[PDB]
Point group: C4
Chain length 335, copies 4
């Protein structure tokens, strides 16, 4: 029985081959941004409210036209068969059962149509390809398969310098492939417009950190943004999303959904993100720890733990709803 | 002979079973708030005054209609028989003899009437129960037994997630019971009004951290508040009380007594709390360390040590009275 | 050959009995103020000037009517025979030869008249005694013996709680006595006036930390103040003098000399103190390390090292005089 | 194959004699400024831009009338034969091949004419000598040999106190000499004018930290400044250049080139410096690590690694040019 997300990391480190654990855990360069994602969350303290009605505490949100059970989605993580033989299908099944959206990756190790067939609330994460038509075809495939949002990753003109992967000489095992294919181009604002024109689905720009890029995303017709430094895996020295979140929320002024990711490791961290103004969070590495440790059941247990932690934190902070949690104030401390 | 409160923790760790020490020491979640209570106090430095008249230094205060020997009371700590066979009676006797108020708990392991019969200045801490009449009956019992204040704990709609207790599988020994009974409901502002209407005693709301909740407490007719994150045992990531204290003192503008707790471990810490504007502090864990180490005599020695440290700190800071200590300025440093 | 003051501490720790080293090294309480004296200096960075005339760099100052070779004096340290058999005579001789004022203590282990007979620039440090006439007699003795200033210590209404001394059961060896005698009273502003009326010498109030106490010192006719927390030995949690220095210098606006002490361990630290506005610094523990390590010759070597470090730091910062160093700007960093 | 600059330090420590490694690695005094150079860079986070055109990312700059391949030059480091038998010739050859300017030192262990004959973009670093005519002769020699800029080091009126060198008893081996000679005087603003009047080359003042000294440098006709604390080797406690850079860039308002050095250890650090407003950086110790580890080929590999890291960081931050990188915003964090 896992009582924190840290129990799952320990379990995953035991089972996974070192080089695969490093592919999962690592960041770019000196891992400054990877560490800062945690530092930033640890500096935030919540000012809870007391004596409020908690007779019907609900962790639900509405996002992109549908109810979610928590203010949380599974982040896009490439090549999930690296962590467990059932890969993306195990994670998607658990997410569906927990009422949490699951983000299907462009670089999924099971085809997007197979993962979408699991049901639930699939979103689709897009990388822009050298061959543009390939990009727009993926978008159409995702929409045809019932994906509900296009999460366009905008912080990967190319992959960052992952020194753990370089030192390990890491390569995909022959048994893991990019199953949507039978190569990156940098995305631009023109690419965003091409995607927006090609789909009725909300387009969510993932990897926004500058306030003016958040404003421009709204002007460009984005339905959402994810304020994110890609888990510290892209620019080493990029500011944590959590540090830009409040300023971004103020600047977009309700014009789109504002999600955040990077270092969410508890329901308390979800509360902090919400209190700083996030609509919802993405969670990456912990979901893969659970997958590695115990497959679908592991992911189920993680999501049940997170759900309990979110409920606990919200109620202790005097919040009967996620909207109330967004109205909490915070104070920076020292750790 | 103990020369600091840290001597008593070492003594208590030696004698207590690990799981009981963990029940006492622990906090919720990652223990971020537990640690921050100490961090916050360690960041505060006092700007002492020199050359003032110290011919009659007094540590006494008047609070809730009676003199106390120090600006301090024993915090409510449940189930004191866990720490020593005499439990609450040992602590109450020592508090009485030292001229310090003692807070009798709803979850006391000796009945509130027995503890009140010890004499001194008993206060009574209330938890709100699912069965409302049970709550109001406890209040009436406390008043009938001569308790002087009702300390309504407002930060426990339910118990926080104590991971040490979960990992240890901690449960009360068969020989420790909730002796006031032969179950929590969240308290609301309506509950506060019901208590206020049912007693002539001052009602003190314990667990206030938001400035507007402090204001509302005054408007609600509270005689006092305790600015507190419950010793880091409730919301993990809740701001330390000491960090909100100055802002709260300014906002209530003499409308009620403003106490603080969390991490007080010396007379110097009492001085810091006073300098930040507290009327008085509560002390929890150290009192239980002393109880565990040496029963009633241990608690007596702790309170004598604290009294000496408070006198020493006040005089070295140029303060002949607690009111003068409240007029001291402070400066944050780096530790 | 010693290349830093830290070489001398290592040497002193080797030779001294543990309890005597602890009497020297220790502070009050948790030693928070002792550590903060070092933290505060380490946070200060100097903004040096370049390309200035350094053809005649001088470290000299004028203070209390006489030239000193450095902006530095030996702090009052009680009972110097604890550290070396020649005690105060060894230190005073070395100070004289280096052109540095030496502060003779009320609790000197050699009589003030003997130490004054060494020559140089003796100052005299006063503690206020229960028997007032005793205090004023010491002042007259000091003046008759040729002391040039009365350093009235104002932060010792009684001795702080030195936990190292308590734990060691420290007491003076039978062979060390208070040689000025054959008992503390708290000093007040009235005591200061009594001293000022009884002497033509400048009165310097040592242990001022509050800005208004610095202002009042000027109004009271003080010739100087020492901004000081008594080396972290009095109020545990007292702000470092170095943190109050700039504000105090601005407030007194040339009305008296403003010295600082606490944690000066290099010529660079002297430069920092000067850049923050100090007229001069006092140095305590390092002088005793040198005395313990090698007697008079040890103190000589320390003062020669400090002189070289001060000259080096001043010139590298573009300062041909101490006045120029006072006009340097500083910037706080992170350590 | 080296994947970070830290790989090269490890390699250099293995090969070099301890005292030579210490001469290279060390700083003055307590090494506070040496450490702070790294601390300051680690506190800076970049706010990257997304979705910009990256079809022709270029790391080139124009400086002092010529193109450089990166916003970087090799810092002046004395006596390079200490690190490898080919010394300055190996480093200059690699710099030439990489399109990076190389700064020839007054204290080069190969003559400036020999190093200039390598080709590339040689600059010449000047120390002011007691014998003025010697100084101006070096300037004329440098100009006659085809050096493109005079880097006048202004922070060495004399050498700082290098405690590692003092403790090691470090001296030049008989086989390393100052090859430009067959003695320091402090430089002043008059010295700067004498140099400016004696050459048509841009004069660059290296070691400026005060904003008013930067302003005065522009007024004095400097073509550039290097904002620098001399790698923590001169005044111990001098502010890092990176901490003064933004304020200096604002004050000079395009009046000269503003370079920075101290602690640059990656392409990400180059990006940070650029984002804070630097025209270019100097890199010292890492170039010598590469020289020690593998001679000319080692330096080539270092410069290729740095070039890749700079390109990577710029593109990930949305910058197609160094000018765009200068328009990035930054945010301080906690490490
Ligand atoms: C192993 C791994 C693979 C990832 N793959 C992708 C990807 O293909 N597309 C993408 O947009 N983000 C990807 N991310 C970034 C995540 O979506 C997310 O931003 C990050 O994991 C959030 O931080 P967290 O892991 O600290 O929760 C990946 C992250 C990891 C750790
Ligand atoms: C073992 C334990 C039991 C506690 N029980 C109660 C309780 O029943 N009611 C309550 O209001 N607070 C309770 N508290 C919180 C304390 O009243 C107080 O807020 C906290 O101990 C203060 O922090 P300190 O222990 O650092 O002094 C408890 C604390 C501890 C450590
Ligand atoms: C062993 C010891 C004895 C001291 N005795 C006295 C004293 O008798 N009178 C006094 O005014 N200050 C006394 N001081 C305080 C010093 O004058 C001075 O404020 C302190 O040493 C400065 O800090 P530093 O030791 O870090 O340089 C003493 C300090 C020490 C360490
Ligand atoms: C071993 C060594 C020798 C140096 N010699 C000189 C010199 O002769 N002239 C000079 O202007 N700077 C000199 N410097 C300072 C460098 O030019 C530069 O300011 C510093 O190395 C930059 O910091 P970094 O080493 O952290 O990159 C030297 C630095 C080192 C480490
Ligand atoms: O961070 C990651 O690993 C992914 O975003 C990713 C990026 C580029 C190629 C493959 C996978
Ligand atoms: O500086 C601020 O207050 C924010 O940028 C911030 C910093 C660190 C964590 C969260 C939010
Ligand atoms: O913190 C504690 O242990 C008490 O406040 C407490 C809370 C809930 C149930 C029992 C005891
Ligand atoms: O930020 C502040 O100054 C206060 O909130 C505060 C912070 C830390 C300790 C005590 C008080
Ligand atoms: O700090 C010290 O030791 C002295 O100031 C001191 C104070 C009181 C009595 C003796 C000595
Ligand atoms: O806060 C400030 O700037 C000063 O009080 C100060 C703080 C720390 C060291 C020196 C000076
Ligand atoms: O830092 C260094 O070593 C050089 O700047 C230097 C300075 C003075 C003499 C020789 C070398
Ligand atoms: O205080 C500031 O913001 C700057 O001086 C600064 C500080 C630390 C690193 C870079 C820049």
């Amino acid at each position: 029985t896992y009582v924190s997300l840290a129990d799952l990391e320990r379990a995953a480190r035991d089972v996974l081959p070192g080089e695969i654990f490093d592919f999962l855990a690592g960041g770019s360069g000196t891992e400054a941004s990877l560490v800062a994602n945690r530092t930033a969350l640890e500096r935030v303290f919540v000012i809870p409210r007391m004596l409020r009605d908690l007779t019907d505490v609900t962790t639900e949100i509405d996002i992109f036209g549908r109810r979610a059970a928590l203010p949380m989605a599974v982040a896009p993580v490439a090549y999930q068969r690296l962590f467990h033989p059932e890969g993306e299908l195990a994670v998607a099944r658990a997410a569906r059962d927990a009422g949490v959206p699951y983000t299907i990756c462009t670089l999924s190790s099971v085809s997007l149509e197979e993962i979408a067939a699991v049901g639930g609330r699939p979103w689709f994460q897009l990388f822009w390809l050298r061959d543009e038509k390939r990009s727009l075809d993926l978008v159409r495939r995702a929409e045809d398969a019932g994906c509900e949002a296009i999460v366009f990753t905008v912080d990967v003109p190319w992959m960052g310098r992952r020194l753990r992967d370089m030192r390990n000489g890491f390569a995909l095992p022959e048994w893991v492939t990019a199953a949507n294919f039978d190569e990156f181009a940098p995305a631009t604002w023109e690419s965003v417009e091409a995607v927006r024109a090609h789909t009725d689905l909300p387009v969510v720009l993932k990897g926004i950190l500058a306030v003016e890029d958040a404003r421009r995303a709204v002007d460009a017709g984005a339905g959402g943004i994810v304020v994110s430094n890609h888990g510290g895996r892209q620019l080493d020295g990029a500011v944590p999303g959590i540090e830009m979140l409040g300023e971004i929320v103020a600047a977009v002024s309700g014009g789109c959904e504002v999600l955040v990711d990077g270092g969410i490791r508890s329901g308390g961290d979800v509360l902090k993100a919400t209190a700083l103004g996030a609509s919802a969070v993405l969670v990456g590495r912990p979901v893969m720890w659970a997958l590695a440790a115990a497959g679908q059941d592991g992911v189920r247990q993680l999501l049940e733990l997170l759900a309990e932690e979110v409920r606990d934190a919200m109620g202790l902070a005097g919040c009967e709803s996620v909207g109330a949690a967004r109205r909490l104030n915070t104070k920076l401390g020292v750790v």
